[PDB]
Symmetry: C4
Subunit: 80 residues, 4 copies
């Protein structure tokens, strides 16, 4: 009904648009260079560091793989 | 046939891409700092204020939760 | 095999990300201010002019309504 | 677990958000002007050159067509 359930702070702007895994993990990039994987309760599952801002929005493969781009020129494939 | 059904004014640019819930509510961010929830008929359901421009496009969880990023560095989870 | 099927010229950059109707129409916004609806064969079905750049990516409601944001501060609902 | 499966280098920033085909190809644009099609093992299937940065995120038709916008003002439809 438009109340905060929770808010996770990253180190920079979040322009990336979140994706949701089969188990409800939320994946989103940040200008702080990381891809984040966050649990449905608001805690960090893991974060993967790229060489640049992650403005790209993650996609999730059939086998759980997370793809997303970065400012650092690469497209990343990361295991869930 | 490409005719205006309605247009809902926010206080700034809308770069965010809208999402549509199971009940047809539309979720979209604006550079005015708000995430908006709008009824299919053009009237505001609720708006949630963030600390910055919402350029992220919202995603919707299986239980109705709306996730979006903000320029204020946070990832938000909001109840429907 | 990675060959051009066709290409449609708009009047400016296309930063928007295309959406696809049930009937195969492609929707996409452009810096030239317009949302385009384009037939699967490469020709214009209709175009709707907004007050500003359409960086927002269209979404399609269950009744065929196309929702998109504009730089002109509005979220638009357009009949298919 | 958050471990790199693989990373593909393009010639510039990847702001485009990856799309995944029915056959698991990953498609994504780059500031280097190309749309890339990459196999689930990390190797290039093919790349199509546009006149400008591809910040748009690709969408995929029911018939496998890949649609994406470009800074060069066009919407492109490309065969898989």
């Amino acid at each position: 009904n438009g109340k905060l359930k929770w808010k996770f702070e990253t180190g920079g702007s979040v322009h990336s648009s979140p994706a949701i895994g089969q188990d409800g993990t939320i994946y989103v990039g940040s200008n702080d260079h990381y891809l984040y994987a966050i649990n449905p309760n608001g805690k960090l599952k893991w974060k993967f560091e790229t060489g640049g801002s992650v403005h790209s929005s993650p996609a999730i493969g059939q086998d759980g793989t997370i793809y997303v781009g970065s400012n650092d020129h690469y497209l990343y494939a990361i295991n869930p």
